[PDB]
Write a protein that binds this ligand. Structure first.
Ligand SMILES: CCCCC(=O)CC(=O)O
Ligand SMILES: CCCCC(=O)CC(=O)O
Lengths: 258, 257
């Protein structure tokens, strides 16, 4: 047995809260675990309109990374959009991350940039069902914020999770600022000396979506990680739908990658 | 007793937010009822930060607004948890016609007679200075402490002690500070009378293992139309005894149709 430090980064609309099942599992197993709210997510005091810059969004993670004690390594886990966050963290603090885990996460690299993975990720999300956008940047300008609808969540995201967790999400999802492609590319810059030097595992966790799986496959091909693992039966929120499996997978990764 | 579709309105306590009711919400939406769970000021995903709302009417406003916008002839079952007892009390005075039955789940239940002054001072003593709860002095040492912050140990020992462990984790990630409202503010915001507040039906739900003597005391000074019990509940009944709460709420809905 070795005590580990897991660090959990959520996706669009979400927060630290979505990890509650895993947090509990990690804690009562005697491991250390931090689950962070990004900008204007969960109980982060910023509203979405106050963080138009991607660095503002990534800020809770960056400052936490900068705050980590000397001889300490972590297991950095990023879910879906959470992948961009943990990528930037790897480039900036490679000497603090024992291994980075991309749970069906956006995983850009030199051969497939952040601009690419984001336009594609946002295609499945924008316009789907009862989702909606705001126009505080002007009614003739590109949409400002994106808001997850209850029906979108139920049918596209939590479609394989318990009904209480849908309810939980419904009372907690917060709007996401629609960061400009240019801003995201300027922000998430990756080298092979740094980001490339961090051990990296991808977790394919999707079901009943061939197009999404292809996107995850394409990302693994253009930016090959050290390992690829898999969790079957998962909807778009694995920490809700397949939590025991995910915790096992995360403990397994942690122990062998020391 | 035939099933009639009803609308439940759920109101949380200090540090919490609509999220705490997640299990109740799912169970009602499954049964064919309407349910709305609300964030009060600077609770859950409400935009206001606690320091931005030193007046009680601002803590209460999301409920008061919801109540006002309710269509003409619709009545509701209104559930106040603990601190949420004051909010539903205020709502009972302003909009008595709109509430078929008010339900006080271990709630602060002052009457026209026992002032909201006394009730808060008692509620404060068991929270303030308890274990790892800490206060903050944003307006300096000259003035009263500004916010109250619930500590993870206080949560583990006095609030969540009988709840599944994952619910404790959920809470550590979501609890928010609460502005320490002055009892002079609450006194003047919560003005209760026997004509209005008194006209609304009231049920109190005791949580056995929640103070067992203070909750007992409020019933003497302000008698509800009934008392009910849920055994083995901690301070968050909706977390520890959700099904018992859910069925009790159904049962309650019916007797006071
Ligand atoms: C930019 C839109 C976010 C893309 C996603 O990855 C959707 C999700 O995680 O729910
Ligand atoms: C002064 C606020 C105390 C009210 C409470 O009793 C809050 C709780 O449920 O722990």
């Amino acid at each position: 047995f070795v005590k580990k430090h897991f660090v959990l980064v959520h996706t669009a609309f979400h927060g630290a809260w979505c990890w509650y099942k895993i947090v509990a599992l990690m804690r009562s197993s005697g491991h250390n675990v931090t689950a962070l709210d990004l900008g204007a997510s969960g109980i982060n005091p910023k509203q979405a309109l106050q963080i138009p810059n991607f660095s503002d969004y990534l800020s809770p993670l960056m400052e936490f990374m900068a705050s980590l004690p000397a001889n300490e390594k972590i297991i950095l886990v990023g879910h879906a959009l959470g992948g961009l966050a943990i990528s930037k963290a790897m480039e900036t603090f490679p000497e603090k991350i024992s291994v980075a885990v991309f749970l069906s996460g956006l995983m850009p690299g030199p051969n497939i940039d952040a601009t690419t993975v984001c336009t594609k990720a946002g295609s499945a999300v924008l316009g789907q069902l009862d989702n909606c956008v705001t126009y505080e940047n002007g009614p003739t300008n590109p949409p400002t914020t994106l808001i997850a609808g209850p029906k979108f969540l139920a049918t596209n995201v939590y479609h394989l999770s318990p009904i209480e967790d849908l309810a939980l999400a419904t009372a907690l999802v917060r709007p996401l600022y629609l960061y400009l492609a240019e801003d995201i590319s300027k922000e998430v810059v990756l080298s092979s000396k740094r980001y490339g030097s961090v051990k990296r595992v991808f977790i394919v966790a999707t079901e009943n979506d061939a197009l999404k799986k292809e996107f995850l496959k394409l990302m693994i091909e253009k930016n090959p990680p050290d390992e690829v693992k898999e969790i079957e039966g998962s909807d778009a929120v694995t920490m809700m739908s397949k939590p025991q499996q995910l915790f096992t997978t995360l403990l397994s990764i942690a122990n062998k990658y020391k």
